[PDB]
Design a protein around this ligand. Structure first.
Ligand SMILES: Nc1nc(=O)c(N)c(NC[C@H](O)[C@H](O)[C@H](O)COP(=O)(O)O)[nH]1
Ligand SMILES: [Zn+2]
Length: 183
């Protein structure tokens, strides 16, 4: 699976995140892919990010978009203006964890940062590949569906993604076990 390989590279990015009690260590990779029977060799990496890579309370997907925006001299909320939008290619994002539909901090959730890349004549991010649903007791995937963003869960990496994600948590072992039980 090309998707599993991408998610393992997202995991390596997630491992750069500093452990904190209030969030998850996640990694994200933005890819430009040819429409149709694509060859993975023709994939182009557009950006990458990981949790708290950039100053402030930042998520992996947020840093991925903000890294691109910074190179292009716009704030991240304007990254839709400068992302590629080529007729024969689509933007897809790999993320270890399901993008968030709500943040306890009140920051704009990652599903909304993804949705707003589709503005004006720009195609934006068309599909999300992720490895685990967000752990815990309105789901991000449902918000993506409602806005017309495709997504696909890539199975097989759940334990490794979760153990990295919750390394900064006191309840990490129970948290991982609970999340695997939802499979
Ligand atoms: N996909 C994803 N990538 C991340 O980089 C990250 N940190 C989360 N975590 C989602 C979780 O719901 C939020 O971490 C809490 O809601 C606390 O909110 P803040 O992070 O402090 O804004 N999820
Ligand atoms: Zn998020």
């Amino acid at each position: 699976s090309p998707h599993a390989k991408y998610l393992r590279e997202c995991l390596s990015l997630a491992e750069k995140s500093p452990p904190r009690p209030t969030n998850f260590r996640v990694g994200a990779i933005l890819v430009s892919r040819k429409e149709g029977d694509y060859k993975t060799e023709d994939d182009r990496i557009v950006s990458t990010g990981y949790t708290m890579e950039l100053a402030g309370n930042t998520h992996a997907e947020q840093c991925c978009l903000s890294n691109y925006a910074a190179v292009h001299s716009v704030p991240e909320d304007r990254v839709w203006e400068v992302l590629p939008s080529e007729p024969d290619r689509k933007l897809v994002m790999y993320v270890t964890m399901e993008p968030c539909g709500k943040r306890l901090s009140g920051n704009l959730p990652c599903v909304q940062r993804i949705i707003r890349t589709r503005q004006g004549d720009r195609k934006g991010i068309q599909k999300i590949y992720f490895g685990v649903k967000e752990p815990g007791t309105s789901e991000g995937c449902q918000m993506l569906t409602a806005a017309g963003i495709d997504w696909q869960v890539v199975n097989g990496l759940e334990r490794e993604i979760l153990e990295v994600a919750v390394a900064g948590h006191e309840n990490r072992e129970e948290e991982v076990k609970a999340a695997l039980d939802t499979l």
